Amino acid sequence: PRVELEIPEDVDAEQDHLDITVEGDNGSVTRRLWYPDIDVSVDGDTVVIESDEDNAKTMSTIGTFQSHIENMFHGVTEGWEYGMEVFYSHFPMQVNVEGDEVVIENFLGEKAPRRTTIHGDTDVEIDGEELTVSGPDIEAVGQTAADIEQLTRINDKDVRVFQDGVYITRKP
Amino acid sequence: KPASMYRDIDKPAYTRREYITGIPGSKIAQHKMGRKQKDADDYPVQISLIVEETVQLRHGSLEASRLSANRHLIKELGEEGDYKMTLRKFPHQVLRENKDGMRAAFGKIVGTAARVQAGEQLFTAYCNVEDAEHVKEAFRRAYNKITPSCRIDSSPAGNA
Amino acid sequence: AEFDADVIVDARDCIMGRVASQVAEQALDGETVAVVNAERAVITGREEQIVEKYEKRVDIGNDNGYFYPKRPDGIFKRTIRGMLPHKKQRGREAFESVRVYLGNPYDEDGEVLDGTSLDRLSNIKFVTLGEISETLGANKTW
Amino acid sequence: MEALGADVTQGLEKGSLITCADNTGARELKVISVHGYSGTKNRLPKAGLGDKITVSVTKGTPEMRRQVLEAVVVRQRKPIRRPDGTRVKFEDNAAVIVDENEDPRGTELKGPIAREVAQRFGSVASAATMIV
Amino acid sequence: PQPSRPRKGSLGFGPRKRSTSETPRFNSWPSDDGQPGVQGFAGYKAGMTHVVLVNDEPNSPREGMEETVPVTVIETPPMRAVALRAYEDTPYGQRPLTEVWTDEFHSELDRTLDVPEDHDPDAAEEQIRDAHEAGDLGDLRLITHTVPDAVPSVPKKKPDVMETRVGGGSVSDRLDHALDIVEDGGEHAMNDIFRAGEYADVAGVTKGKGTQGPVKRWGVQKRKGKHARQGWRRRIGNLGPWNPSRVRSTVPQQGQTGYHQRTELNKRLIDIGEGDEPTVDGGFVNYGEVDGPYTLVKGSVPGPDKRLVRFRPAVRPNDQPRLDPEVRYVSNESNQG
RNA sequence: CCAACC
RNA sequence: CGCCACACGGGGUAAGAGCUGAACGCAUCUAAGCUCGAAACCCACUUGGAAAAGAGACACCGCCGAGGUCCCGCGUACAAG
RNA sequence: CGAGUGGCUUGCUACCUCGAUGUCGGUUCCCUCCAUCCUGCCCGUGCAGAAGCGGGCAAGGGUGAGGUUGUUCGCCUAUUAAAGGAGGUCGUGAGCUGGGUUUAGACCGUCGUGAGACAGGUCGGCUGCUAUCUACUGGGUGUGUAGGUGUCUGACAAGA
RNA sequence: UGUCCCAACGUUGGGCCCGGUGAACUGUACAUUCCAGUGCGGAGUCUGGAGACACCCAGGGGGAAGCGAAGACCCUAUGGA
RNA sequence: AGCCUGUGUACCAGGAGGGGAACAACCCAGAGAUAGGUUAAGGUCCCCAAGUGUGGAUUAAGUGUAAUCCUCUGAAGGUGGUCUCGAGCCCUAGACAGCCGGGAGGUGAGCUUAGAAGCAGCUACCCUCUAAGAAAAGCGUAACAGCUUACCGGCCGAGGUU
Ligand SMILES: [Cl-]
Ligand SMILES: [Cl-]
Ligand SMILES: [Cl-]
Ligand SMILES: [Cl-]
Ligand SMILES: [Cl-]
Ligand SMILES: [Cl-]
Ligand SMILES: [Cl-]
Ligand SMILES: [K+]
Ligand SMILES: [Mg+2]
Ligand SMILES: [Mg+2]
Ligand SMILES: [Mg+2]
Ligand SMILES: [Mg+2]
Ligand SMILES: [Mg+2]
Ligand SMILES: [Mg+2]
Ligand SMILES: [Mg+2]
Ligand SMILES: [Mg+2]
Ligand SMILES: [Mg+2]
Ligand SMILES: [Mg+2]
Ligand SMILES: [Mg+2]
Ligand SMILES: [Mg+2]
Ligand SMILES: [Mg+2]
Ligand SMILES: [Mg+2]
Ligand SMILES: [Mg+2]
Ligand SMILES: [Mg+2]
Ligand SMILES: [Mg+2]
Ligand SMILES: [Mg+2]
Ligand SMILES: [Mg+2]
Ligand SMILES: [Mg+2]
Ligand SMILES: [Mg+2]
Ligand code: NA
Ligand code: NA
Ligand code: NA
Ligand code: NA
Ligand code: NA
Ligand code: NA
Ligand code: NA
Ligand code: NA
Ligand code: NA
Ligand code: NA
Ligand code: NA
Ligand code: NA
Ligand code: NA
Ligand code: NA
Ligand code: NA
Ligand code: NA
Ligand code: NA
Ligand code: NA
Ligand code: NA
Ligand SMILES: [Sr+2]
Ligand SMILES: [Sr+2]
Ligand SMILES: [Sr+2]
Ligand SMILES: [Sr+2]
Ligand SMILES: [Sr+2]
Ligand SMILES: [Sr+2]
Ligand SMILES: [Sr+2]
Ligand SMILES: [Sr+2]
Ligand SMILES: [Sr+2]
Ligand SMILES: [Sr+2]
Ligand SMILES: [Sr+2]
Ligand SMILES: [Sr+2]
Ligand SMILES: [Sr+2]
Ligand SMILES: [Sr+2]
Ligand SMILES: [Sr+2]
Ligand SMILES: [Sr+2]
Ligand SMILES: [Sr+2]
Ligand SMILES: [Sr+2]
Ligand SMILES: [Sr+2]
Ligand SMILES: [Sr+2]
Ligand SMILES: [Sr+2]
Ligand SMILES: [Sr+2]
Ligand SMILES: [Sr+2]
Ligand SMILES: [Sr+2]
Ligand SMILES: [Sr+2]
Ligand SMILES: [Sr+2]
């Protein structure tokens, strides 16, 4: 099978070996697309994903390679963003960005600060109780968002009662 | 007692009641369920539970499978639903158990079982096109209580 | 420390067992062989099960001893020894005229033996001797 | 528990008979167990200055005898070491009966108590006549 | 039901044989952080005494109070970093590449080695620097030796030689740092490396006891009660089950006990001085008198008096440093009594 | 449990 | 029976929590990819270890003499050795 | 009701051993298994919390002291994070013990005309050997690598 | 009251080294073994691997279903007392 | 049961040699000596003589690389893991899914009830506008409200579904 993806005018896509790099006004994203007998390549103004095999396993990755590339297109132009709302009940939760990691303090009244390192060149901006995660690499951005949320996960007590934590509000 | 002790046909046919005494009573409550005043011909659908391996089924197992099957047909079609199911086999084979080492080992009589050849119909139901899946479900439950794997074969039924 | 090898084999991207089988055949025919870039040799399959097997060999043992190698260096050589009657005279001689190296200590480039090459573009389930060694706890000196 | 403030060489074991240094009506106590303790194979459970122990009353008033109670070791013959290196030892081994809250069941204590025991059990201390 | 119980003795210090080098050999060194510096020193055990100290611990209920502490007096005179050895990285690990020696040698270093008469410190240095440019240089260490003569209580004059890694800033900087030391005469001291209050790991060959039985050597029980009068008093029950049909090396048996290398971790250095402040009246038993560079190590140190002990900056400290503890008293009371 | 006679 | 000392930190995982993600336009923690995650695995630490047969490395000394043995006084050592 | 796994119990068989492979319980000392009692990390809840209850990963470490009884098991007591189970000739008598069992003496009950019998009870009642080989714990002498001194490397190996 | 917790130090005679004296038990053969398997189902010797340079000293006894005694139990004998 | 006890037969016993890792009776094979040659069972990547043989397909579990067997396990039950073959129905008059828009009036049906308005219960379940839109399929409310399924239209464009 063969799939052709016309690359956006705003974007330029270079690729060597199993690595593919995409660049736009919003930045660049490089990914390795490696699977048995699936050849990815840049043919002029279009990226081509093709293979001589057509079994369910191959078709699966092909469709997977496409969305990965179309996401890279989107990220280098429009960019990717996730919104998050910090919610707390009794203890005022302090959420701040320090260096390459978002730090949280006074979670449920904890003396020890919880933290996580931001992935990629992902940018994290907080405005009061709102938080926005964004960048060109959907992988790094999506994970950073997820990490922030997971960072306030609780297994010890009934969540329905203890709901404090930062949550993903909007997904791109 | 495990069925592994009696599921195989590895002994002579032992059914002559004129030469066997003390045979326990069968636990099978009924062989004809549903509306038995009606004929099987009055139904558009006929589904049978077919055994895939030749085996012996102790009367205790027949009662369990028949029960968990019909019980479902009652719960889903009512104590008087328009259907009829039949358990066409009867436990004629008398079983023993040697319960004194290997001396004078001929066992005492402990039960009965029905010999079923692979490919045969153990149960057969007759229903309306509506309750076709309810009977297929009653059988799924029944074949979980008898040794062999089974085929739920649909005879008259071209409503696919 | 200088090894006049009549043959220099390049194990990079090559199936370990297939190279081993041929290096043994040649060693018995009197050839002096040097296998190079062992850390890059490859073994097909699911990495998790492969490693579980080599980890078991490492854990096995007792007072008599079952010294199993962890470096790709030794892993490969042991692999070859298992294809040689190393306890017989001709077998120990063959085995002793075969050496394995991390990287390539020669100026020449090794040759790729036919039938032993693995195409990375057609295979995703395989591991690298070096990777195995690292997992085993070897000190990645290569 | 709160650091004792001195190193102790346990001078007592399960089954040891000691003096009940109070006015509860119990004269002699038998060590049965040591709170928080867990030994090793064949090792007889040991207790010393500062430990809380379960005890049974071997000698005393009818009402007290045979009762299984909690107590606190206040004195022992085996030496203990204080921060300045000096060893300290008493004339006998003695414990004070105590309740679920570690308050002395009795009203008065008899004989001296080690200061270290005071730290741990203040209410026990606020009953001591002499603290050495 | 056969209660459980940990085995007798540790399996981590074997085989329990006689040590090959009476001079300890560290098998690990501190990490490279601060400025370049020699990562170790040595001395000779003299004996013990005690000292009253002011509780330094900021988390102790006794902070600021008198505290008696046991101390082992080690005579730590100056040593001489006599050479600079360079290791290169290779497929088979680290290997010595070359050494840069000096000219000034202690008068009796010739009781152990064949002192160099003709050497090229620049050709050596040259080869080393080329190794760094190439990026094949492994760590850098100094061939070091003691000066037994400086110690009257120790009869040996023959110096003890050991290699001590040099860690520090960047390699270029500590390589230069190494070369400097060596060139002079290599004469360095305890002060140069340690500060009173820091934690050091001490290594040494324990006191020898020759052959000893399982009871003493492994801590197995003696036979008990009736089992102690039938003919067996200090012998273990059995050498193993019927199967496996062999005696495992894990069963406690008789053999060499003592005279093994041991590395004792986190020993706090209470004080580093010089003179006779720590000496004891009558002299340290079986040793003599102290009056020179000395170190007071908190607690015990492996080995008998006169044995060579080695110091290294603690590689796994549990507590932060509390420099220069206040010593209000140092016992000089006779040790005989 | 048990290590023979039942 | 006395006294001293015996981590922290890394790396990869299980169960599990998730991200991106298609087969199946959607959905999906999984099929490829990835972020995490156990007293458990590896490393860290201690001990042995040139007989590792690929039987090792470096420096200096020496080949008419470097070094060593016997011998003598002794123990930080030791059943002989 | 149906399907299995284990090889701890019991039964069955009579394949091995009667020119003998000493028998229960305990003890001592070593290795192991996981179907996990505690400890680490998780999932669910009839999960507010605290705590329970159930489930998953997981064998690194731990799982102790006592009263009756030869007892195993078990019953019981106070402690405990917990005081898990099992394999190793029901590990371990050329290691120990000798309470039980298991000769010869003796008694009771029952049985027997009697001699005498009883995994019924009861009191007493014998445990040999200087290690050849192998195995391991430690200690030496040689040869090999191939003049000497000193210093190291680290394949492997052990640890809780 | 060291039976025990929990073991320590010491004494005498041995043990160890040296001179002299100088047996016995046991011996089909080979024999440096270890892990599994196989086999009359309980192997140093068979099979597959692993390990293994030779010799010697001391040791406590895991194995040689160790040595010592044609099993005292049980059964069988047209046996004995 | 590698059990007990029959029966017919060939084998071991008393049967080598070749193969089966080893292995009384499983396979080839019945064998004077010596010699050349060709096969049998079985095998041809190395150990070890002969293929890293050819055309093709499947498997990703190291499944498997194990004729027979005390010896080689693997079951009832389950599987949108994957490959292949067939039948029915729907579809460029636009299917399946997704996303957007519409989902409306008589009327909050009648009854029951203080109240019940799609949705407590009972009964009925009719017709307007229209390209659709139930006397309402599931949540939701004290009852409303509110959120959706049906049903229709659009965007999309090729197989979809049982
Ligand atoms: Cl080993
Ligand atoms: Cl061989
Ligand atoms: Cl693959
Ligand atoms: Cl207790
Ligand atoms: Cl004992
Ligand atoms: Cl014939
Ligand atoms: Cl494999
Ligand atoms: K016998
Ligand atoms: Mg809870
Ligand atoms: Mg005990
Ligand atoms: Mg003194
Ligand atoms: Mg004094
Ligand atoms: Mg027999
Ligand atoms: Mg015997
Ligand atoms: Mg488990
Ligand atoms: Mg373990
Ligand atoms: Mg036994
Ligand atoms: Mg024995
Ligand atoms: Mg005996
Ligand atoms: Mg003996
Ligand atoms: Mg008795
Ligand atoms: Mg008796
Ligand atoms: Mg009897
Ligand atoms: Mg006889
Ligand atoms: Mg008799
Ligand atoms: Mg007679
Ligand atoms: Mg015969
Ligand atoms: Mg060949
Ligand atoms: Mg398998
Ligand atoms: Na009978
Ligand atoms: Na493979
Ligand atoms: Na191993
Ligand atoms: Na004796
Ligand atoms: Na035995
Ligand atoms: Na980790
Ligand atoms: Na079974
Ligand atoms: Na026993
Ligand atoms: Na465990
Ligand atoms: Na008991
Ligand atoms: Na036995
Ligand atoms: Na005995
Ligand atoms: Na016994
Ligand atoms: Na005594
Ligand atoms: Na032995
Ligand atoms: Na007679
Ligand atoms: Na024949
Ligand atoms: Na053969
Ligand atoms: Na396999
Ligand atoms: Sr039969
Ligand atoms: Sr079935
Ligand atoms: Sr070949
Ligand atoms: Sr050293
Ligand atoms: Sr080391
Ligand atoms: Sr005795
Ligand atoms: Sr054995
Ligand atoms: Sr996971
Ligand atoms: Sr050598
Ligand atoms: Sr015999
Ligand atoms: Sr498991
Ligand atoms: Sr737990
Ligand atoms: Sr009992
Ligand atoms: Sr038993
Ligand atoms: Sr045992
Ligand atoms: Sr007795
Ligand atoms: Sr009895
Ligand atoms: Sr009797
Ligand atoms: Sr030779
Ligand atoms: Sr062999
Ligand atoms: Sr002996
Ligand atoms: Sr081929
Ligand atoms: Sr093919
Ligand atoms: Sr068998
Ligand atoms: Sr089979
Ligand atoms: Sr199945």
Give break positions in chain C: residue before each, C–N beyond 2.5 Å. none
Q: Which fold has domain C1-142?
A: Ribosomal Protein L13p; Chain: A; (3.90.1180)
Nearest to C22, CA basis, from C133, C129, C131, C115: C115
Q: From the alpha carbon of E163, which nucleotide's C1' atom is closest?
A: H151
Q: Which fold has domain E39-77+189-206+258-337?
A: Elongation Factor Tu (Ef-tu); domain 3 (2.40.30)
B77 CA from J113 C1′ (Å) = 34
Instruction: Count the alpha carbons within 13 Å of E314 in the hemisphere toward its beta carbon.
Output: 17
Alpha carbon distance E134, A92 (integer Å): 56
**Look-up: residue for tokens 């270093």?**
E109
Q: Across-strand partners of A123?
A: A134
Domain borders along chain C are 1-142
Would you call E206 exposed, middle or buried from its count of C-beta atoms within 10 A (0-12, 13-18, 19+)?
middle
Angle formed at CA E306 by CA E304 and CA E311, multiple of 5 degrees: 85
Count up the domains in chain A and report the number. 2
Nearest to B155, CA basis, from B136, B130, B134: B136
Tokens read off for C35: 């296998």
User: Which of A37, A38, A61 to mutate: most C Cβ within 10 Å?
Assistant: A37
Nearest to D7, CA basis, from D71, D67, D70, D84: D84
Which nucleotides along chain G are within 7 A of a protein C-beta? 1-8, 12, 17-24, 31-36, 41-50, 52-62, 66-67, 76-79
Give the orientation angle of helix C129-136 with respect to helix C72-81, to 10 degrees: 110
**Look-up: residue for tokens 């230069």?**
E176
Alpha carbon distance C128, E103 (integer Å): 51
B44-78: burial string, b at 16+ Cβ within 10 Å, e else = ebbbbbbbeeebbbbbbbbbbbbbbbbebbbeebe
Backbone Cα Rg of chain E: 24
Nearest to B45, CA basis, from B160, B158, B157: B157
- Closest chain C residue to E136, measured at CA: C141
Q: Which fold has domain D1-132?
A: Ribosomal Protein L14 (2.40.150)
Statement to judge: residues A128 and A87 lie in one domain: yes
Question: E92, C101: Cβ pair inside 8 Å?
Answer: no
Question: E91, C63: Cβ pair inside 8 Å?
Answer: no
CA distance C46 to chain A (A): 15
Neighbouring residues of E230: CB distance < 8 A, sequence distance ≥ 6: none
Host domain of residue A84:
80-172
**Strands of A123-127's sheet in order across:** A123-127, A130-135, A80-87, A165-170
DSSP E118: S
Residue pair D81/D105 in contact by the 8 Å Cβ criterion: no
* Chain E residue numbers touching C65 (CB-CB < 8 A): none
Q: Which fold has domain E1-38+207-257?
A: Ribosomal protein L3; domain 3 (4.10.960)
User: Which of C44, C121, C124 to mutate: most A Cβ within 10 Å?
Assistant: C121
Would you call D44 exposed, middle or buried from its count of C-beta atoms within 10 A (0-12, 13-18, 19+)?
exposed
Question: D85, E3: Cβ pair inside 8 Å?
Answer: no
Q: Where are the beta strands (DSSP E) in chain C?
A: 7-10, 33-36, 42-44, 98-100, 126-128
E128-144: burial string, b at 16+ Cβ within 10 Å, e else = bbebeeeeebbbbbbbb
Count up the domains in chain B and report the number. 1
* Residue C73 three-state SS: helix
- Closest chain E residue to C72, measured at CA: E91
Identity of residue A105? E
Tokens read off for E6: 């940990």
E194 CA from J31 C1′ (Å) = 91
Identity of residue A85? E
* Chain C residue numbers touching A40 (CB-CB < 8 A): none
* Chain E residue numbers touching D42 (CB-CB < 8 A): 221
Nearest to E334, CA basis, from E284, E276, E298: E284
E94 to chain C, any CB pair closer than 8 A? The answer is no
Q: Across-strand partners of B94?
A: B112
Give the right CATH number for E78-188 from 3.30.1430.10, 3.40.50.1820, 3.40.50.740, 3.40.50.720: 3.30.1430.10
Cβ atoms < 10 Å from Cβ of E157 = 13
Angle formed at CA B15 by CA B11 and CA B18, multiple of 5 degrees: 135
User: Which of D1, D84, D86, D87 to mutate: most E Cβ within 10 Å?
Assistant: D84
The reply to whether omega before E121 is within 30° of 0 (cis) is no
Please, do chains E and A touch (3+ CB pairs < 8 Å)?
no
Host domain of residue B11:
1-160
Residue pair D71/D17 in contact by the 8 Å Cβ criterion: no
Nearest to E139, CA basis, from E266, E264, E24, E40: E40
* Chain E residue numbers touching C101 (CB-CB < 8 A): 91
Nearest to E160, CA basis, from E168, E142, E148, E177: E148
Domain with B91 in it: what CATH number? 3.90.1170.10
* Chain D residue numbers touching E66 (CB-CB < 8 A): 83-84
CA distance C31 to chain E (A): 25
Domain with A29 in it: what CATH number? 3.90.930.12
Phi-psi region of E305 (alpha: psi -120 to 50; beta: other; left: phi over 0): beta
Alpha carbon distance E145, E242 (integer Å): 53
Alpha carbon distance A147, A141 (integer Å): 10
Residue pair B117/B52 in contact by the 8 Å Cβ criterion: no
Residue pair E267/E202 in contact by the 8 Å Cβ criterion: yes
The reply to whether omega before E15 is within 30° of 0 (cis) is yes
Helix (H) or strand (E) holding C48: helix C47-59
CA distance E53 to chain D (A): 9
Residue pair B21/B119 in contact by the 8 Å Cβ criterion: no
Residue pair D114/D5 in contact by the 8 Å Cβ criterion: no
Nearest to B89, CA basis, from B138, B137, B56, B44: B56
Statement to judge: residues A157 and A87 lie in one domain: yes
E245 CA from I24 C1′ (Å) = 30
Q: How far is the CA of E5 from the centre of ligand 38 (A)?
A: 14
DSSP readout, E7-38? -SS-STT-S----S-SS---S----S-SS-EE
CA distance A37 to chain C (A): 5
Helix (H) or strand (E) holding E49: strand E41-54
Residue ending a domain, choose from A79, A94, A120: A79
Residue ending a domain, choose from A57, A79, A101: A79
Q: Across-strand partners of B84?
A: B34, B126
Please give the span between the terminal C-alpha atoms of chain C, in angstroms, as a whole number. Answer: 18
Residue ending a domain, choose from A28, A57, A79: A79
Nearest to C64, CA basis, from E249, E19, E110: E249
